[PDB]
Amino acid sequence: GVKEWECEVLSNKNVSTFIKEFVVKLPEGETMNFKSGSYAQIKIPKYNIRYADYDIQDRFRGDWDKMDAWSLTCKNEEETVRAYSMANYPAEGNIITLNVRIATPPFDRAANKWKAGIKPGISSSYIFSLKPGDKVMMSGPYGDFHIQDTDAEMLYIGGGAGMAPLRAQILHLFRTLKTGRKVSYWYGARSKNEIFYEEDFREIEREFPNFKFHIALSDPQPEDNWTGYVGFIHQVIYDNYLKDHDAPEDIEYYMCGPGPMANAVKGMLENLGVPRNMLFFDDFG
Template structure:
């Protein structure tokens, strides 16, 4: 009996000792000391402790590169040009790199460790990215899987309509059996749905993952409450309103409503209502529709604005009560896949005289299908802007 008790204790002690020894050796062997990060030809030089990923080294110095996955190497967003020899591209980087980017020394900042002095290039606008301490002002259930999150910020934020910010998700424990728990800290990117004029706040639309297991979405849907504190970083992104006179074709789905809501509210506030806008929003069924009354009210105030909700499911569950004074006629809801609906309207309803500019926000399959339609209808690839998630 004593053997069965003592043996595991001995093995455990040996394992613990080996772990400690490895930790000590790692600290000695991989002690890179202080290294210098030269940014944009000495526009800014940082002295950091060597050995950490570039993404983390920069964020610790309050320079934030976009990273929708929180530095896990699964989003491909944290790209930077690295002009120093940091070794070959890793298998975790290559799926996110075009041939042009590979030739141009583009790397993922979360995958490159800073082991010696390093020269990098990043967009100048990233120097304006800030970290904000926010208080949850409100959370509002919009559909069975989408929550509107409204935050009050500790300082004003300056952004263009259509850009996004990153929510910093802390550790949390499951409230009940079957719920998700998370240990550590990560970040997730969400488009800002509030207009730039509301610069002391930030509003987001957060859609739950289909399996309910999303780290960030579970936290927002099941843990965040009014009065709680959360950090957010931004703004980021090159998906924003281009100011010209072309006809806008906007296509979204799910939480892809967010950037368009920011853009439309900004356009109305800025008296840009001479511009023609066609907004197509794809849903599966009636329960997926939200902000419908708001869009119908906007149509009445803005004659050049047209909003079409398209429902793709074969069997639809129409609500028993329908207030036409709020929602408009049932016929205003089109049945069909979003790319088919867009194609029909562009062929039959929308004049090409002013030229086209297209904005797409949603999942990859929706974006792919609608891009094909847009190109077939004569929209230039250079005039198609994407926010894919």
């Protein structure tokens, strides 16, 4: 039993192909005190929705056409609660920003459809239907995933909607603390179109020599005209930075992203002789 507001939705626009930037506001003069990397919880009610009702911009709708995502529907028959990480820094109290990955079902290559009779994500699917002016019930903060009090080097590894916690921590580190720690953020996206929040970080690195941001694309598309790093995030990170680093084991690793990306990083660190307690992982489950 924890703190709960009803919030108005300011903005639910697509920020990549499958991540909406979901922005809600607390009642006037209300505020959520949280530490960066904590998460909140949305009440998802009973409901019904067709994916054909979703608002997607010209440049993101392309993959939805390909996969026939517009044909999906989702019925939720029991009220529930779901976790989403805060993506803005704690200095903004009543405009909470979230990053929501729409949980499409598995794609059954055998019939070239989605695996039949499997429901999409009852929570992500509801949030995606939300529009400016709507109301959501939200509680927080929760969670333990926080910056360590050290002078240590930090290396951030993000993937997918795992942007949320890192960005909150990195924004806190540089916009409010104005830290002197050395900090790199390596974010992996499938292609150029799927990057977001880039300028936020280009700004920071222009003000702080001690911060670097690198993007690595796993499946770059011809239209990207892509001159930068390419491949798996852990491969990119190891190939360029770590391999030649004097002491990888003195670094704190903050990562958030999907199971494959995390596990492949874990296995990499392990061989590299980095001890488990130097890795801080926020598990989206």
